[PDB]
Swiss-Prot record, chain B:
It is found in: Secreted; Membrane. Belongs to the peptidase A1 family. The active site is at 56. Disulfide bonds join 47-51, 89-126. The gene is REN. Renin is a highly specific endopeptidase, whose only known function is to generate angiotensin I from angiotensinogen in the plasma, initiating a cascade of reactions that produce an elevation of blood pressure and increased sodium retention by the kidney. It is linked to Renal tubular dysgenesis: Autosomal recessive severe disorder of renal tubular development characterized by persistent fetal anuria and perinatal death, probably due to pulmonary hypoplasia from early-onset oligohydramnios (the Potter phenotype). Tubulointerstitial kidney disease, autosomal dominant 4: A form of autosomal dominant tubulointerstitial kidney disease, a genetically heterogeneous disorder characterized by slowly progressive loss of kidney function, bland urinary sediment, hyperuricemia, absent or mildly increased albuminuria, lack of severe hypertension during the early stages, and normal or small kidneys on ultrasound. Transmembrane segments: none annotated. It comes from Homo sapiens. This is Renin. Interacts with ATP6AP2. It comes from the Eukaryota.
Length: 162, 171
């Protein structure tokens, strides 16, 4: 229990900060915003129709390419101002920096064109609490805490200027 | 260029200076703290009787309620467009400091911290890194301190002690 683990972020235009995670075996990589204002992990699903603009320019998670994927299928929905974000629960191995964690996440099958088509990243890693988690899905940082590998139960953000 | 960095299990001293100052969460379950004021220049225009602040790393801007931001912008001379607020680019560098009263400290953003200075011309309009967003209950009504804030203040989210720590970011 002596590790700190870091993730380099990309700054897009002072409005979007994102870095890389890997989902599955072998790892399918995704750019994600690490968001203290939400508690879920979401990535687009290979099951998102190409008739959704937000899905056509982003990386899609494919369960049928992962050997460590465990099906769940519970439909879950996020209520956004521009429309509904919906998808379903899946479990797989998520790598963040030097850390591997088995995690439940949502695979998105539909989402409003806006603002999602304007994101340079593919998904979100929620860093908030189980209390605000849709479906009371255990947040990733809670699964990292449970591992007892961290030096401290903290995480920190640096954001540069562009 | 290094766009940013998240550390899990610690912080990175090469990216902040001095020591952290901490504020306790209002209630566990959300990364929200008490705010005790917002100063334009040296006068406390807003949140004079305390309000809430969400420390939201997934937000681009500092946000307040429509009423609070109407008032903030009225004081900055900023004009409401459809989505954002703007100023004539030439007045950008003369905009007053804005301070957020959090814990024992004032967190001061200068104009360079919140004006998108894409030009210095009076014929051009420059955007502000502050927007109005009405966040519905339970979380809100609340301010949200997004990237605009985090850029200036290295932020630590502490689950062990249920606190948020701010130190001056080293760029
Ligand atoms: C391409 C893509 C993007 C996403 Cl988020 C995604 O996950 C679906 C999950 O949906 C969402 C949507 C909003 C949120 C907000 C919750 C609180 N913080 C800001 C977040 C916020 O506004 N954004 C969205 C956002 C923020 C900004 C930055 N500017 C806005 C002022 C914040 C720009 C674009 C987008 Cl789409 C969350 C944190 C990323 C969380 N999850 C999937 Cl499956 C695919
Ligand atoms: C999906 O996982 C959750 C665990 O919280 C559970 O409530 C639900 O029953 C699961 N769905 C399945 C596999 O039936």
């Amino acid at each position: 229990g002596n590790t700190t683990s870091s993730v380099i972020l990309t700054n897009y235009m002072d409005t979007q900060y994102y870095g890389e995670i890997g989902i599955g075996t072998p790892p399918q990589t995704f750019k994600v915003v690490f968001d203290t204002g939400s508690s879920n992990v979401w990535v687009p699903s290979s099951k998102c129709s190409r008739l959704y603009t937000a899905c056509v320019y982003h990386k899609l998670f494919d369960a049928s390419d992962s050997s460590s994927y465990k099906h769940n299928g519970t439909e879950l929905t996020l209520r956004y101002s521009t429309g509904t974000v919906s998808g379903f629960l899946s479990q797989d191995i998520i790598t963040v920096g030097g850390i591997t964690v088995t995690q439940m996440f949502g695979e998105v099958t539909e989402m409003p064109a806006l603002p999602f088509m304007l994101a340079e990243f593919d998904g979100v890693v929620g860093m908030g609490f189980i209390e605000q988690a849709i479906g009371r899905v255990t947040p990733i940082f809670d699964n990292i805490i449970s591992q007892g590998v961290l030096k401290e139960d903290v995480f920190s953000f640096y954001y540069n200027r562009d | 260029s290094l766009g940013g960095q998240i550390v899990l299990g610690g912080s990175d001293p090469q990216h902040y200076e001095g020591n952290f100052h901490y504020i306790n969460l209002i209630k566990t379950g959300v990364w929200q703290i008490q705010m005790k004021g917002v100063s334009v220049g040296s006068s406390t225009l807003l949140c004079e009787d305390g309000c809430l602040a969400l420390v939201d790393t997934g937000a681009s801007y500092i946000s307040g309620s429509t009423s609070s931001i109407e008032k903030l912008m009225e004081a900055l001379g900023a004009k409401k467009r459809l989505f954002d607020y703007v100023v004539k680019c030439n007045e950008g560098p003369t905009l007053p400091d804005i301070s957020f009263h959090l814990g024992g400290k004032e967190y001061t953003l200068t104009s360079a911290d919140y004006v998108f200075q894409e030009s210095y011309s009076s014929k051009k309009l420059c955007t502000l890194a502050i927007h109005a967003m009405d966040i519905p209950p339970p979380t809100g009504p609340t301010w949200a301190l997004g990237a605009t804030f985090i850029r200036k203040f290295y932020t630590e989210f502490d689950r062990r002690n249920n606190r948020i720590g701010f130190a001056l970011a080293r760029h």
